[PDB]
Amino acid sequence: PEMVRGQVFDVGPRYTNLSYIGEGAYGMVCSAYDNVNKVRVAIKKISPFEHQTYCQRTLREIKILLRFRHENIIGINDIIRAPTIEQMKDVYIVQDLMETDLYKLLKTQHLSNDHICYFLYQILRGLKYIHSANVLHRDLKPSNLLLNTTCDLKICDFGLARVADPDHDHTGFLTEYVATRWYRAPEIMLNSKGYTKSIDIWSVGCILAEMLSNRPIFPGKHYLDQLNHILGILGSPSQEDLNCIINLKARNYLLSLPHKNKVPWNRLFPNADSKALDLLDKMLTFNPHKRIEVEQALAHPYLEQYYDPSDEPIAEAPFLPKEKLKELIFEETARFQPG
Numbered sequence: 001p002e003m004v005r006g007q008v009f010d011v012g013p014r015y016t017n018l019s020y021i022g023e024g025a026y027g028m029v030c031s032a033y034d035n036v037n038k039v040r041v042a043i044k045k046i047s048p049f050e051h052q053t054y055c056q057r058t059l060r061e062i063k064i065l066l067r068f069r070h071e072n073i074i075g076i077n078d079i080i081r082a083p084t085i086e087q088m089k090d091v092y093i094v095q096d097l098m099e100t101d102l103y104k105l106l107k108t109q110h111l112s113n114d115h116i117c118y119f120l121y122q123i124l125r126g127l128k129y130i131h132s133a134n135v136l137h138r139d140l141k142p143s144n145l146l147l148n149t150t151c152d153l154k155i156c157d158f159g160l161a162r163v164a165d166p167d168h169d170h171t172g173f174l175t176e177y178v179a180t181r182w183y184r185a186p187e188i189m190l191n192s193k194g195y196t197k198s199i200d201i202w203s204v205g206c207i208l209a210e211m212l213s214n215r216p217i218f219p220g221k222h223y224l225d226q227l228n229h230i231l232g233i234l235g236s237p238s239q240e241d242l243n244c245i246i247n248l249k250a251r252n253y254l255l256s257l258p259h260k261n262k263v264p265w266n267r268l269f270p271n272a273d274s275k276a277l278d279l280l281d282k283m284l285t286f287n288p289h290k291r292i293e294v295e296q297a298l299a300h301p302y303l304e305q306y307y308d309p310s311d312e313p314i315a316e317a318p319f320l321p322k323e324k325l326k327e328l329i330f331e332e333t334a335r336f337q338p339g
């Protein structure tokens with residue numbers, strides 16, 4: 001077995017000459033030379049089987065990424081695992097190798113307005129397809145946007161995804177932890193389980209803001225702080241927007257706050273394209289019902305050089321204990337075995 005940092009990284013003989021890239025959600029990530037297709041590839045080792053939540057996430061991701069086929073969504077090229085359920089301790093997911101990701105780029109590179117436009121276009125193009133399949137990504141953030149040397153962008157990590165369920169979205173105050181904090185819509189903290197498409201649009205808005213300045217727009221220091229940062233920029237919600245929050249704990253919290261004025265986007269982002277700030281405003285709407293949808297966002301003037309709905313495809317086919325989830329992961333990966 002190939003070894004990387006004294007841990008088994010067992011993918012051979014098809015995949016050789018491994019280099020450590022980083023660590024994924026729970027497991028190691030390497031590049032490797034693919035001896036069939038004669039390209040270097042990315043391979044992430046997942047060791048999920050003792051923890052039901054890693055089993056769940058592994059199976060979601062496998063099921064979704066095997067059904068999806070889109071230029072702006074990472075595929076699965078191959079899956080490696082032992083030939084029997086008994087011997088299977090690890091699963092390796094083989095994907096296109098991408099040079100970098102938007103997290104790494106934003107830490108080091110100023111983006112021209114043309115780069116911001118093209119990246120945002122690709123994000124929304126991929127999102128159109130995901131949403132058209134009635135799926136919510138639910139963890140969109142720069143580190144889940146992979147980029148290659150010619151700035152092609154692919155959305156990755158579908159472990160936290162769900163099927164949309166707008167009729168069952170309502171919940172109480174300060175209960176929910178959907179998404180990564182900086183990219184979490186205000187309603188998550190107030191009255192939303194994150195089961196509507198508007199959750200992803202908020203995250204995209206946050207990413208666009210971050211492309212504009214190389215800094216997260218809402219850098220909450222901890223879970224409770226995240227609302228402070230959102231309201232600090234958007235200002236106090238309107239009466240109409242408060243009237244949409246029927247839950248009393250959530251409503252009365254908001255009513256308890258001193259008035260806060262909106263910070264104008266052109267003061268926060270003085271170098272930004274005015275069309276980009278108009279779209280940003282629309283994606284970072286407090287009220288999720290008023291928030292722009294993915295197809296509207298694509299049709300926005302900022303994206304006019306790229307927009308072409310005939311070239312923005314949709315999905316053809318819209319969408320348990322750990323021992324049964326191992327069996328389902330075994331069944332789902334069977335197509336990649338010699339046979």
Ligand SMILES: Nc1n[nH]c2cccc(Cl)c12
Pocket residue numbers: 025026046048053054055057058059061157158159160
């Ligand atoms: N923790 C995880 N986040 N995203 C994943 C995708 C596949 C498998 C796992 Cl365990 C995860």
Ligand SMILES: Nc1n[nH]c2cccc(Cl)c12
Pocket residue numbers: 021022024029042044074095096097098099100146156
């Ligand atoms: N560099 C990468 N190319 N492709 C990937 C898929 C998942 C995780 C990573 Cl880090 C990569």
